[PDB]
Write a protein that binds this ligand. Structure first.
Ligand SMILES: [Mg+2]
Length: 223
DNA sequence: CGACAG
DNA sequence: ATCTTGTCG
């Protein structure tokens, strides 16, 4: 499954950031109306200090049926640095993406999207490469301010960057902590919340695209 | 000084 | 993310 290599990955943090500020300029926060047919999810596990195993799950909507699953295990050199995750989990994902045969209508990542210090989280960054609509679903905050929603099964609040709306916090499960949703590329707030609320079966905290992509991500690190 | 996706 | 088993609701 093709894509566009917009630049090189091995860059000292400082350049990587200049790359991000430049890229943020090509983001299209357009709407996504209508229901999707094919929906994928991405995640990475780490079998070794510097070895990561990437995994992509493509699902049939709304039957949530698993139509295809590819992977790619490899070396990881760029260290983890809040705000620069794309330069870590990004390359190995693209290696797995090449093995994919079904065309996703929208891919969903395990990390921020618009809710990033420079408005370019891994979700944003990858959408630009593979030019498909993307969303970012994270389990903790990185950027933006909000009002912790009620602990009621479907409550929610908006994620702000001042007066600007950049995402939203949803409590998809009682007793458990909220998730952080924000648009990648070719996507907007009101749409992502809609869709994400749609991909989360009752009783679970995390949506199926990512919740399965993770399971395989850990499992493949063993049996 | 604090904060800081995975 | 990862180190780790049982245990509490
Ligand atoms: Mg992960």
């Amino acid at each position: 499954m093709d894509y566009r290599q917009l630049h090189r990955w091995d860059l000292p943090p400082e350049e990587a950031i200049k790359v991000q500020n430049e890229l943020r300029k090509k983001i299209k926060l357009t709407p996504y109306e209508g229901e999707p047919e094919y929906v994928a999810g991405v995640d990475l596990s780490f079998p070794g200090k510097e070895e990561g195993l990437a995994v992509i799950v493509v699902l049939e909507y709304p039957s949530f049926k698993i139509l295809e699953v590819v992977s790619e295990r490899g070396e990881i050199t760029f260290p983890y640095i809040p705000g620069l995750l794309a330069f870590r989990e990004g390359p190995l994902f693209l290696k797995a993406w090449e093995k994919l045969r079904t065309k996703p209508d929208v891919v969903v990542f395990d990390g921020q999207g618009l809710a990033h210090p420079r408005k370019l989280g891994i979700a944003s960054h990858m959408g630009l490469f593979i030019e498909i609509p993307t969303i970012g679903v994270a389990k903790s905050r990185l950027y933006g301010t909000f009002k912790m929603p009620e602990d009621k099964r479907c409550s929610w609040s908006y994620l702000y960057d001042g007066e600007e709306i950049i995402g939203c916090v949803i409590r998809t499960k009682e007793g458990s902590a909220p998730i952080f949703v924000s648009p990648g590329h070719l996507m907007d707030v009101e749409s992502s919340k809609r869709l994400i609320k749609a991909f989360t079966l009752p009783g679970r905290r995390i949506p199926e695209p990512t919740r399965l992509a993770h399971i395989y991500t850990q499992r493949l690190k063993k049996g």
